[PDB]
Design a protein around this nucleic acid. Structure first.
Ligand SMILES: [Mg+2]
Ligand SMILES: [Mg+2]
Ligand SMILES: [Mg+2]
Ligand SMILES: [Mg+2]
Ligand SMILES: [Mg+2]
Lengths: 274, 296, 113, 64, 93, 104, 348
RNA sequence: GAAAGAAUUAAAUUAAUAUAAUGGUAUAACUGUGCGAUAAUUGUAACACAAACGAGUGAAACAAGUACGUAAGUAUGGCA
RNA sequence: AUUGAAAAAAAUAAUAUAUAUUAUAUAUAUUAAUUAUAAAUUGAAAUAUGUUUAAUUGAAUAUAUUUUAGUAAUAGAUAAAAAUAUGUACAGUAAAAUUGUAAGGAAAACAAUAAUAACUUUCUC
């Protein structure tokens, strides 16, 4: 290479251009994934979803009535603070970091018809620490996530290095699966219907849990996963079972909106809120 | 008009005046360039023609010009003979086609065309045009205009009088007119007597009727009759129709009916087992001699 | 040759895998391709229409809420403060449950507590 | 002593060779380059014999 | 049509009576065989399933009998009852 | 000293051939504690399941239910053996005989 | 059934082949597909299950929606709104899709793809916007054809060129392609396909071909020479192949001169430019304009001033390139031009 | 009023760059991917930076062949 | 082409054949395959030839032949953990910190954390 200097030449037209469509290679990526002609095609609306229907029928209008605050206003989040102009050194100064945090926080809008707290995704995190020695056990995690969730599990490999823990970087230990749409709805339903009402000392999901801006997480122990229908049927072929982490992502702006929302899908809460 | 090297050294590509400037397209980026002239402001207006420099000069000396014209890339020098041989091969093919067209025009037909060479050249161009994707109306004009060209141009370069151009253009007009109304090509780029479109439709229907009623092909004489019907079919059928009709009627293996399939006699071709998915069992279909077009 | 655990895990990995476990690609005739396209186009429109109908209903519902709030505030502020109180810890009664495909043996209960 | 010097001889019977460096036991080097006396790109193979480090082949076809 | 092959070799262990009961419960596919013509095409079977079409897998322990979705209140047209319309929303007018 | 199965040459899923994963599943009916049945899309090959204990018979999920039958796993213990082996000594009237030790 | 009737709708909104229509509208799975010809392949093919019942209802769903749109289209008066409503009413007809996607869009036949119908005009526009327009503008951009000749281009009509007379072989010229002196030695033709609603009984077009690469040894730079010029050309949505049939010697403001590059003079870009004449209202018939042949340099030609003087709006363009070969000398003598100059191989 | 798309703006070079420090890099020079293994080739190299000489650095251009890219073009090893 | 149903065609592209031009174009025919590649006394399935039961034909039944089983991860132009560090073409944006999550804590893995003015399309009042 004669030089390393990136400089894109400006154009003389407004027409948006995309070299993918006019390159003869890969004639099958040109078709959309949803298109029937694509080899990546997969039907989406195979059957109706009961949980989604419930939310759209009953919980939709109810939540709008619950969260409504009369003549509420947008609460701006902690953004970067500009430099007051009183010295000749502020002309190119980067702005200050937010007041109490090093990361900007989002705004909170009043709840209206367009924005009503609703589900969007569910992520299952499974980190088998014991895989440090026996890698073969990590495969059992992917099968467990596959059988239960019903979707392809994306594997989890190490990223850090803690010698005190015999942890080595660059080894497979677990699997994760992103769930959306009807399949997520089935998982959430079968979790509250079957698995949850089978723990002896179960009290519910802690009110302290949850990211500040939407998102609620809890965890299932090793023995709780035996309660799933697809392991209970073949206990012989499941000698070893182990826990996982659950994270429910929702359109709730704040946590307390999400907790009210998830309660409509038969989720209990026990602790005291912040 | 400036470059950059491995060491990020900036160097000029053309003679000019070096100016340091800032391009509004790239804020927070200083620039260096080379304006082609002193009075030129380097951040040239975006929507104005770029200021280029030809630089290279013309070779006035006769010997220098001769050397340069006769100087070609090794690719061209090595490909010089092969391309010429192919040109000679195709020229011979054109010559043979011209000879064949003239023979059929005078012998197979009895048209007295005054200009043999002009008539043949028009037709060979029409045939080549028709071979390529071209409707009949376009093909005839394309050849017609071509000939009428190289005649207005010839008049200009040879300083011909207007009358000479007019008579030559008129002469081309009539010969093409006569050729169009008296000659045509039949589904294979072969010259033959003109056939009207309406007549073509009438003949096509007659053939379709004459071919439908005789589709049993029981006896070799019928086979000959069907094949005989497919002799002048090219005159009034396009290639797509011609191939389709043959596939429908000239079937290599005829449908298996009671007469065609039988086991009482021996040497019924061969067993020819297939599979049926209704009964999920292998079947034996011994075909008879009068079930194959090749043998019958 | 290979340990029994590896054999078992290979089988579990086999159930994960897609090797020699998928059919031939779905090939449709040109006319059935147009058939499929019109089916999807209707379904897309139908889903959009249902979604817009729900949104319009929620538009009106919110309109109704605010007009109710405005009137309650001007007439009797004593009740308005109670109405405008937050519902941070509100929870749906757990007796309400997502609909099931088929009804239970006992459709309803006439006793509580 | 880690590196080594090898003489790559043109596959064409040209007599033109180019030298490159290589590790002590890296796989046999075969590269295509311009050979001036033939005026075309030709393969260049090793001249002498080198002790290549043994490597296990890949099992593209399922085995056992 | 795009459905994957059922991995019966995992759920049903070799030699299990349930495994052999399932094998009989199923119907095998047609296999390619030299010297025999096939109108619909040479069979393409892998893991014991034709790859050119879908696959059918035939499957107190009293049978699950779902309850009827139409109740007595529906046929009797009783208006006071809370079961007249199970799948709808009732409002007290 | 780690147990890792060696990795074979990964096959090349070149661009455009990335088919989705459609795992074999069965329309399986889930029988709850009551007559309620929900259809679940499952991989295991058998169409009906009964749930001995589920949200229906859990007090936490039905706070308002006055009558709530309770059933647990049947592997061995009270419901299994203590009852048939002791089928004469009967009662919670009897539980009042051992009610308190009356000790400070 | 608005789509079934043909009292006022054009016949082009239908499947000309009866067998195809019968299968597409079949009531039971009893007809084999027409597209697959071999009976053996016909047997092997298996349609997806439960595809006919859902299609029939999907057809009805669209049919009612189309009827509503047509009723709305009846009551309006704005031609632009009228065209939009029509496109919106019939864009979902399976027949319209089958007619368009499956038959030639360049050499469209009036029976299947009629470009007078708004729906086929709209679909053709979208198709050309997907590939053709995207490729054209990249060629004009990366070849620096735009800024050298005109400030910019906003395409509105597909432009295609050909040289049918030079050699007799049919091939539509890809933009930016390399053409020999023999191939471009006689004449180009054009297919100015319009897609925007325009009054085709009044609107007129001009076609100019420019070569902004001719050496100018006086200023050590380049100068633009006019190659071919036509003015006052009528067009029609379905018959828009500009050729000697459709124009007379009055339209030719500059007779075509072949690309005749000089040796070592570098590549030369011939940019085809298609504009549209001004449309003056309050007058019956087209607004013929008399071009001023007086100046018309044609050797040092300034397109920008030419467009500004006559108030022309560019709608499409095309480009091809030419270098020196052995045939240039033959072309020069054929056209009676002075022998070309020979330049050096190096720049100094 | 709503859904999707194209995206825009602000912040960011503190992460990353085979290797010290410095300069540069989001238009990425950083990362992922397809082809590839080609330019990690071949004869003339003007002109500049640097410079006592010996040496050193950038490189336009002419000619032969190769890889990638639809094309424009890029590649005479590695951001320096 | 034969094989259960009762004259055709008018797109891009692929394949087969043919030929026009110092133009990698046109004419006709049809829409293959798209996750594979040796090696199995043993598992499964299949067709054919007989028998016994239960015309045909269901089941079992012995043999011959063949097919499945070698069960192995990427299913995404993949995008900050590991391996290909020089070429080309396309595409993307890191990192810290904070809030949570069974073992899990200061330190393992996952998820969330700046604003939509204007533009295009679709649906809708
Ligand atoms: Mg580096
Ligand atoms: Mg640095
Ligand atoms: Mg100096
Ligand atoms: Mg010196
Ligand atoms: Mg690099």
């Amino acid at each position: 290479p004669k030089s390393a200097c990136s400089l894109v030449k400006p154009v003389h037209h407004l027409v948006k251009i995309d070299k993918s469509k006019l390159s003869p290679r890969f004639p099958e990526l040109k078709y959309d994934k949803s298109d029937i002609r694509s080899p990546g095609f997969k039907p989406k609306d195979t059957h109706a979803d009961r949980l989604n229907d419930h939310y759209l029928n009953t919980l939709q209008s109810d939540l709008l009535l619950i969260n409504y605050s009369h003549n509420a206003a947008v609460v701006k989040g902690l953004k970067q603070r500009a430099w007051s102009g009183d010295s000749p050194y502020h002309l190119n100064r980067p702005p200050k970091n937010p007041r109490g945090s090093k990361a900007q926080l989002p705004d909170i809008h009043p709840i209206k018809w367009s924005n009503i707290p609703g589900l969007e995704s569910v992520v299952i995190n499974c980190f088998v620490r014991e895989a440090r020695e026996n890698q073969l056990l990590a495969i059992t995690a992917a099968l467990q996530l596959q059988q239960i969730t019903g979707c392809k599990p994306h594997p989890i490999f190490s990223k850090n290095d803690v010698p005190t823990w015999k942890l080595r970087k660059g080894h497979q230990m677990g699997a994760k699966v992103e769930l959306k749409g009807k399949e997520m709805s089935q998982f959430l339903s079968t979790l509250t219907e079957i698995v949850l009402p089978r723990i002896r000392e179960y009290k519910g999901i802690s009110n302290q849990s949850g990211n500040r801006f939407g998102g609620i997480s809890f965890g299932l122990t090793a023995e709780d996963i035996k309660f799933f229908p697809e392991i209970d049927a073949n206990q012989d072929s499941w000698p070893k079972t182990f826990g996982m982490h659950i994270n429910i992502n929702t359109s709730a702006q704040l946590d307390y909106q999400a907790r009210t929302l998830l309660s409509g899908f038969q989720f209990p809460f026990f602790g005291e809120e912040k | 008009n400036v470059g950059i090297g491995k060491d990020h050294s900036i160097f000029a590509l053309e003679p000019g005046v070096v100016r340091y400037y800032l391009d509004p397209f790239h804020p927070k980026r200083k620039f260096i360039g080379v304006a082609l002239r002193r009075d030129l402001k380097l951040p040239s207006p975006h929507f104005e023609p770029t200021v280029r420099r030809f630089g290279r000069f013309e070779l006035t000396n006769k010997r220098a010009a001769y050397k340069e014209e006769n100087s070609i890339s090794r690719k061209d020098y090595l490909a010089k003979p092969n391309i010429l041989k192919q040109l000679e091969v195709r020229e011979s093919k054109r010559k043979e086609l011209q000879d064949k067209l003239s023979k059929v025009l005078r012998d197979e037909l009895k048209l007295d065309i005054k200009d043999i060479e002009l008539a043949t050249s028009y037709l060979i161009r029409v045939r080549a045009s028709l071979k390529n994707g071209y409707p009949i109306e376009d093909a005839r004009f394309n050849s017609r205009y071509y000939l009428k060209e190289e005649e207005r141009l010839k008049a200009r370069r040879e300083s011909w009088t207007n009358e000479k151009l007019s008579e030559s253009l008129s002469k081309i007009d009539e010969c093409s007119d006569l050729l169009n109304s008296s000659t045509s090509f039949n589904n294979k780029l072969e010259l033959h007597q003109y056939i009207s479109e309406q007549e073509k439709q009438a003949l096509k229907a007659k053939l379709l009727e004459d071919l439908e009623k005789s589709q049993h092909l029981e006896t070799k004489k019928d086979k000959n009759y069907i094949k005989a019907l497919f002799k002048d079919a090219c005159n009034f059928l396009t290639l797509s129709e011609e191939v389709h009709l043959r596939r429908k009627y000239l079937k290599s293996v005829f449908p298996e009916t009671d007469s065609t399939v039988e086991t009482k006699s021996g040497k019924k071709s061969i067993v020819s087992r297939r599979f049926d998915y209704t009964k999920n069992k292998v079947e034996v279909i011994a075909r008879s001699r009068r079930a194959f077009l090749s043998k019958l | 040759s290979l340990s029994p655990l590896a054999q078992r895990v290979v089988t579990q990995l086999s159930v994960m895998s897609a090797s020699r476990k998928q059919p031939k690609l779905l090939k449709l005739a040109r006319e059935d391709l147009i058939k499929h396209q019109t089916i999807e186009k209707c379904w897309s429109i139908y889903q959009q229409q249902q979604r817009e109908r729900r949104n319009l209903q929620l538009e009106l519902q919110y309109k109704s809420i605010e007009r109710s709030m405005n009137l309650l505030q001007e007439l009797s502020p004593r009740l308005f403060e109670a109405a405008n109180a937050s519902e941070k810890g509100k929870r749906f009664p757990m007796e309400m449950k997502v609909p099931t495909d088929f009804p239970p043996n006992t459709l309803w209960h006439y006793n509580f507590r | 002593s880690k590196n080594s010097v090898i003489k790559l001889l043109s596959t064409a019977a040209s007599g033109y060779s180019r030298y490159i460096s290589i590790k002590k036991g890296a796989p046999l080097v075969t590269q295509v380059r311009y050979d001036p006396v033939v005026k075309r790109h030709v393969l260049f193979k090793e001249a002498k014999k080198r002790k290549v480090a043994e490597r296990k082949p890949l099992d593209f076809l399922r085995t056992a | 049509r795009l459905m994957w092959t059922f991995p019966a070799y995992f759920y049903f262990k070799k030699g299990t009576v349930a495994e052999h009961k399932f094998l009989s419960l199923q119907k095998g596919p047609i296999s390619k065989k030299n010297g025999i013509w096939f109108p619909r095409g040479i069979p393409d079977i892998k893991h014991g399933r034709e790859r050119s079409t879908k696959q059918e897998v035939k499957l107190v322990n009293r049978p699950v009998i779902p309850n009827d979705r139409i109740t007595e209140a529906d046929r009797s047209n009783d208006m006071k009852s809370l079961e007249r319309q199970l799948s709808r929303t009732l409002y007290l007018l | 000293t780690r147990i890792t199965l060696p990795r074979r040459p990964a096959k090349k899923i070149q661009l455009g051939k990335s088919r989705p994963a459609i795992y074999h599943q069965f329309n399986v009916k889930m029988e709850l504690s009551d007559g309620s049945v929900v259809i679940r899309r499952s991989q295991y090959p058998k169409g009906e399941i009964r749930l001995i204990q589920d949200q229906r018979n859990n007090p936490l999920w039905n706070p308002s239910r006055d009558d709530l039958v309770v059933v647990d796993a049947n592997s061995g213990g009270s419901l299994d053996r203590f009852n048939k082996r002791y089928s004469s000594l009967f009662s919670t009237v009897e539980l009042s005989e051992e009610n308190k030790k009356k000790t400070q | 059934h608005i789509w079934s009737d043909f009292t006022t709708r054009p016949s082009s909104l239908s499947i000309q082949s009866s067998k195809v229509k019968n299968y597409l509208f079949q009531k039971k799975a009893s007809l084999d597909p027409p597209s697959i010809s071999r009976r053996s392949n016909r047997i092997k093919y298996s349609p997806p299950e439960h595809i006919d019942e859902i299609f029939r209802m999907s057809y009805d769903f669209l049919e009612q929606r189309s009827s509503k749109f047509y009723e709305l289209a009846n009551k309006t008066k704005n031609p632009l709104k009228k065209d939009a409503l029509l496109i919106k009413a019939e864009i979902n007809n399976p027949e319209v899709q089958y007619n368009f996607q499956f038959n030639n869009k360049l050499n469209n036949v009036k029976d299947i793809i009629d470009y007078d119908v708004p729906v086929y005009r709209h679909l053709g526009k979208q198709h050309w916007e997907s590939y053709g327009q995207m490729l054209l503008m990249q060629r004009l951009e990366t070849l620096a054809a735009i800024p050298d000749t005109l400030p910019t281009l906003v395409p509105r009509a597909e432009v295609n060129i050909k040289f049918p007379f030079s050699t007799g072989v049919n091939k539509w010229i890809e933009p930016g392609e390399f053409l020999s002196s023999n191939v471009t030695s006689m004449r180009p033709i054009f297919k100015i396909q319009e897609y925007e609603l325009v009054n085709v009984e009044k609107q007129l077009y001009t076609v100019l071909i420019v070569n902004p690469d001719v050496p100018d040894l006086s200023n050590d730079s380049f100068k633009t020479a006019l190659c071919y010029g036509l003015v006052n050309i009528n067009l029609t949505y379905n018959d828009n192949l500009i050729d000697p049939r459709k124009f007379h010697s009055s339209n030719i403001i500059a007779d075509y001169l072949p690309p005749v590059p000089e040796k070592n003079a570098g590549k030369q870009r011939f940019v085809v430019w298609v504009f549209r004449q001004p449309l003056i209202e309050d007058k019956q018939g087209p607004n013929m304009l008399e071009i001023d042949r007086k100046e018309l340099s044609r050797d040092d030609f300034d397109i920008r001033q030419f467009t500004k003087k006559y108030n022309l709006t560019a709608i499409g363009a095309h480009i091809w390139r030419s270098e020196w070969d052995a045939k240039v000398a033959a072309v020069r003598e054929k056209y009676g031009l002075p022998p070309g100059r020979v330049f050096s191989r190096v720049r100094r």
